[PDB]
Amino acid sequence: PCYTATRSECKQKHKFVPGVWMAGEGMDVTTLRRSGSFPVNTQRFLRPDRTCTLCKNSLMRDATQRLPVAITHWRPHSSHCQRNVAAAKVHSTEGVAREAAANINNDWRVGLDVNRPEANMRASVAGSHSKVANFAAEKTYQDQYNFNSDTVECRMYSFRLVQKPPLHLDFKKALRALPRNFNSSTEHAYHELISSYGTHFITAVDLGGRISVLTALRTCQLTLNGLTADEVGDCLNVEAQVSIGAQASVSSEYKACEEKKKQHKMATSFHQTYRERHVEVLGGPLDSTHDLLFGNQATPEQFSTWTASLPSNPGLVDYSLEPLHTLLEEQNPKREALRQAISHYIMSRARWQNCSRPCRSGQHKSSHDSCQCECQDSKVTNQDCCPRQRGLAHLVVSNFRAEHLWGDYTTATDAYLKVFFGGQEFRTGVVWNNNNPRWTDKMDFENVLLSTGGPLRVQVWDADYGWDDDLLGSCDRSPHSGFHEVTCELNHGRVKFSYHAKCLPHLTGGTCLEYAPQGLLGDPPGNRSG
Ligand SMILES: *[C@@H]1O[C@H](CO)[C@@H](O)[C@H](O)[C@H]1NC(C)=O
Ligand SMILES: [Ca+2]
Ligand SMILES: [Ca+2]
Ligand SMILES: [Cl-]
Ligand SMILES: [Cl-]
C-alpha cells in the first residue's frame, strides 16, 4: 500500500509508519535483546531527487505515513487477532532457549563458526542468556521443574531492510578504531564492538503484540498431590483462554478444570495456585504492560484494549538476524576478523551439559553413561525420581544388644530378636547361654511408610529346644526421621538398638510428610559455561 510520492506530498508533515526504527537495530543472539545501538542508518526519508515513499495504513484509518528509503516490503496485516492461546510443554532450560530463539525466522548461524566437541553436549547458543532461559535455569538449580508455556500473538506489520543498507557513521568510526585482525590481545577491542552493536542486526521484522507466559511447576510436588505436569498445564491453557475470551465459562475443557478444582480441594484457580511465572509482554503502551492471561485484572475486555493499542504501539514479535560482519565489504580484512570475533563471542557464551558435574541431590550417575542420572529407589519412586506418596522413608534398624537379660525361669538366656514394621518381619540368630547378648544384624526394611507404620516392634525371645520359646518382653516405638537410639526396659535387664530413618528425596519432617525441594549440588548459574 506504499507509493512513490511527489515532491509536494513529501514536504507534508506525516508521521513514520509504526515501529519502523526497529529494523537495522543490533541484537545479541545469546540474550535475544536489542543492543540499543544501530550499525545501520535508516533515518534517510527523501530520495536524491527530493521525492519519497508514503504508505496508506489500513490499521490506522488509512493514515498517510512516511517510509524510510532503507525499508522495503511494508505490509499491514489484519486488525482482527484470533483469540488463541498457543500451549507448549518444555522439560529443560535448553528447550526454553529453543522456544525463545524460535522467533528468529532465518538461519542466524550463516557464515559463523557456531559448532568444540566437548562444549557441544545439548548446547544452547541462541537465547542461552535470555531472561526466560535465566528464569528456567534459576528454577532448575533450586528444584526439579517442568515448564508450561502459554502464548498469544497478533501480527500487525511486516517490513524488511534493503540488500545494501547505509551504515551508521558512529559504526563506521568504531570499525576504524578497531585493529586489523583478531589475535588474542585484540579480543577486548572486538568484544566492545559486539557488546555495543550486537552479534547480529535485525534485517526483517514482524511487528504486533505478544503475551508469553512460562509457568515453572515443581514436578515432584505435583505427583504427591495426585496431579501431573500435563494435567496442570492443560488447565492453565484453558484458564488463559477464558481470560482472553477464546472460550466462555460453558465448554467441555473448562468443565474438566472445574471438576479437578473441586476434586483436589483448591480454594482458588490453577494460576492463583501455581504463581512461579515469567511474563513477557511485547506491544501496547509501556504504561499498561501486564499479564493478560493470568493477571488479577485480566478480563476479555482488557485483552481487546491491548489488541486495539497494537497498530499505533507495535512490539517486536519475530525477526530475521544477520551477523555484523556482513555489513563490511569483502575486500576489507576487518570482516574476517569480526566474523571470527562474533564466532568467538557467541561460542564463549554457550550453555552446554557438563557430564563431569554431579546429579541432582538424591540421584547418582549410572556405570553405563556419565550423562545418565539414576533414581535411588526405583520401586516406590516414579519417573523423574518423585516419591509416589507422602511419608516414604528408608528404615535401617541395627546395633542390637541386650544387658543383664533373663526370664521367669532361669538366668540361662538363649536370646534372639523379632523385629516388625509395615508387614515386614526380621529375626536374629540365637545367642546361647548369655545375659548380655550382642547381635551383628543390620536390618534393611527398604522403603516403608513412616506415617502409616504401624509401630516398630522389637520382641525379645528365649529359645527353648523341644518346647515353645518364651517371650522375655516386647516394646513398640513410633519411628521419626533421622538417627535414633532406643532402650526398652524388660523385667530383667534391657534391650538396646538404633535406627536411621532417612526421608526419600523430596520429603521432610518427622514422619516424611512435608515436601522438600531437591537442588543441584554446587554454585548457582549466572555466567557463560557448561
Ligand atoms: C596481534 O595481532 C598482530 C597482527 O599483526 C600479530 O602480529 C600479533 O602476534 C598479535 N598479538 C598476539 C597474538 O599476542
Ligand atoms: Ca532358653
Ligand atoms: Ca522352640
Ligand atoms: Cl527409647
Ligand atoms: Cl541404624
Q: Do the Cβ atoms of 232 and 260 come closer than 8 Å?
A: no
**Total domain count, the chain:** 2
Q: Do the Cβ atoms of 89 and 147 come closer than 8 Å?
A: yes
Q: Do the Cβ atoms of 326 and 111 come closer than 8 Å?
A: yes
Distances (CA, A) of 338 to 66, 179, 302: 34, 10, 47
Greatest C-alpha distance within the chain: 124
Q: Do the Cβ atoms of 68 and 45 come closer than 8 Å?
A: yes
Please give the Cα distance from 461 to 416 (Å, whole number). 5
Q: Give the type of residue at 105.
A: N
Cell triple for 27: 541484537
Nearest 5°: the CA angle 382, 388, 389 is 170
Distance 443 CA to ligand 2 centre (A): 24
Residue with the smallest CA separation from ligand 1 atom 4 is 181
Same domain, 417 and 469: yes
Q: Is 206 annotated as a binding residue?
A: no
Please give the Cα distance from 85 to 189 (Å, whole number). 45
Please give the Cα distance from 281 to 92 (Å, whole number). 22
Distance 388 CA to ligand 3 centre (A): 42
Q: Do the Cβ atoms of 260 and 114 come closer than 8 Å?
A: no
Please give the Cα distance from 461 to 519 (Å, whole number). 46
Same domain, 252 and 383: yes
C-alpha dihedral over 319, 320, 322, 324, to 10 degrees?
-10
Please report which residue ranges of 160-249 form alpha helices under DSSP H: 169-176, 187-197, 219-224, 229-244
Q: What is the CATH number of the domain that holds 435?
A: 2.60.40.150
Cell triple for 219: 514436578
For residue 39, give the 3-state DSSP assignment: coil
Please give the Cα distance from 49 to 351 (Å, whole number). 51
Spell 57-79 as b/e; 16+ CB within 10 A means b. bebbeebebbbbbbbbebebbee
433 in the Ramachandran plot: left (φ > 0), alpha (ψ -120 to 50) or beta?
left
DSSP 8-state code for residue 372: -
Same domain, 58 and 83: yes
As a whole number of Å, the end-to-end CA separation of the chain is: 49
**Residue 277 burial (10 A CB sphere; 0-12, 13-18, 19+):** middle
Please give the Cα distance from 76 to 17 (Å, whole number). 10
- Bridge partners of 65, per DSSP, are 55
Please give the Cα distance from 236 to 254 (Å, whole number). 10
Q: Do the Cβ atoms of 421 and 456 come closer than 8 Å?
A: yes
Q: Is 377 annotated as a binding residue?
A: no
Please indicate whether residue 184, judged by its CB atom, sits closer than 6 Å to ligand 1.
Answer: yes
- Bridge partners of 5, per DSSP, are 52
Q: Do the Cβ atoms of 408 and 451 come closer than 8 Å?
A: no
Same domain, 397 and 459: yes
Cell triple for 483: 538417627
Please give the Cα distance from 508 to 527 (Å, whole number). 32
C-alpha dihedral over 266, 271, 273, 276, to 10 degrees?
160
* Discontinuities after residues in the chain (C–N over 2.5 A): 115
Q: Is 530 annotated as a binding residue?
A: no
Same domain, 326 and 461: no
Range of the structural domain that residue 374 is part of: 1-387+516-529
Q: Do the Cβ atoms of 317 and 209 come closer than 8 Å?
A: yes
Overall residue count recorded for the chain in this entry: 530
Residue with cell 478444570: 257
Choose among 65, 36, 48: nearest CA to 159: 65
- Bridge partners of 113, per DSSP, are none
Please give the Cα distance from 371 to 358 (Å, whole number). 10
Same domain, 216 and 92: yes
Distances (CA, A) of 488 to 21, 111, 400, 417, 481: 82, 77, 11, 12, 19
Quickly list DSSP for 279-334.
EEEESS-GGG---SSS-SS--HHHHHHHHHHTTTS-EEEEEEEEEGGGGS-TT-TH
* Phi, psi (rounded to 5 degrees) for 503: -60, 140
Rg (CA), the chain: 34
Please indicate whether residue 181, judged by its CB atom, sits closer than 6 Å to ligand 1.
Answer: yes
485 membership: H or E segment, kind and range:
strand 482-489
Q: Do the Cβ atoms of 175 and 6 come closer than 8 Å?
A: no
CB atoms within 10 A of CB 351: 23
Please give the Cα distance from 474 to 375 (Å, whole number). 37
Please give the Cα distance from 88 to 483 (Å, whole number). 45
Cell triple for 14: 506525516
Instruction: Report which ligand 1 atom has the smallest distance to the Cα of 186.
Output: 1
Residue with the smallest CA separation from ligand 1 atom 13 is 183
Same domain, 321 and 467: no
Q: Is 411 annotated as a binding residue?
A: yes
For residue 398, give the 3-state DSSP assignment: strand
Please give the Cα distance from 103 to 488 (Å, whole number). 69
Same domain, 253 and 122: yes
Residues within 5 A (CB) of ion ligand 5: 396, 398, 498-500
Q: Do the Cβ atoms of 239 and 294 come closer than 8 Å?
A: yes
- With a CB cutoff of 8 Å and minimum separation 6, the contacts of 240 are 85, 150, 152, 213, 271, 293, 294
Ligand whose nearest atom lies closest to the CA of 485: 4
Same domain, 318 and 236: yes
Please give the Cα distance from 443 to 331 (Å, whole number). 79
Same domain, 249 and 282: yes
Ligand 1 binding pocket mutation candidate from 180, 182, 185 (most atoms within 8 A of CB):
185
- With a CB cutoff of 8 Å and minimum separation 6, the contacts of 412 are 406, 433
Choose among 438, 465, 448, 454: nearest CA to 507: 448
Please give the Cα distance from 495 to 157 (Å, whole number). 83
Please give the Cα distance from 365 to 358 (Å, whole number). 8
Q: Give the type of residue at 436.
A: N
Alpha-carbon torsion 515, 516, 517, 520, what sign?
negative
Q: Do the Cβ atoms of 45 and 66 come closer than 8 Å?
A: yes
- Bridge partners of 16, per DSSP, are 66
Please give the Cα distance from 230 to 123 (Å, whole number). 26
CB atoms within 10 A of CB 506: 28
Q: Is 425 annotated as a binding residue?
A: no
Distances (CA, A) of 342 to 112, 116, 185, 347, 407: 8, 16, 15, 8, 85
Q: Is 468 annotated as a binding residue?
A: yes
Q: Do the Cβ atoms of 2 and 74 come closer than 8 Å?
A: yes
Please indicate whether residue 268, judged by its CB atom, sits closer than 6 Å to ligand 1.
Answer: no
Nearest 5°: the CA angle 457, 462, 468 is 100
Distance 117 CA to ligand 1 centre (A): 27
Task: Give the resolution in Å.
Answer: 2.8
Instruction: Report which ligand 1 atom has the smallest distance to the Cα of 179.
Output: 2
Helices 93-101 and 131-142 cross at an angle (nearest 10°) of 170
Same domain, 373 and 443: no
Q: Give the type of residue at 170.
A: D
Residue with the smallest CA separation from ligand 1 atom 7 is 183
Please give the Cα distance from 461 to 433 (Å, whole number). 13
Q: Do the Cβ atoms of 34 and 25 come closer than 8 Å?
A: yes
Cell triple for 191: 568484544
Distances (CA, A) of 108 to 161, 197, 198, 333: 16, 16, 13, 22
Cell triple for 478: 513410633
- Bridge partners of 210, per DSSP, are 153, 282
Helices 252-263 and 229-244 cross at an angle (nearest 10°) of 120
- With a CB cutoff of 8 Å and minimum separation 6, the contacts of 49 are none
C-alpha dihedral over 32, 37, 38, 42, to 10 degrees?
110
Q: Is 414 annotated as a binding residue?
A: yes
Ligand 1 binding pocket mutation candidate from 183, 187, 344 (most atoms within 8 A of CB):
183
Choose among 342, 25, 29, 42: nearest CA to 192: 342
Instruction: Report which ligand 1 atom has the smallest distance to the Cα of 180.
Output: 4
Cell triple for 384: 523423574
Same domain, 288 and 325: yes
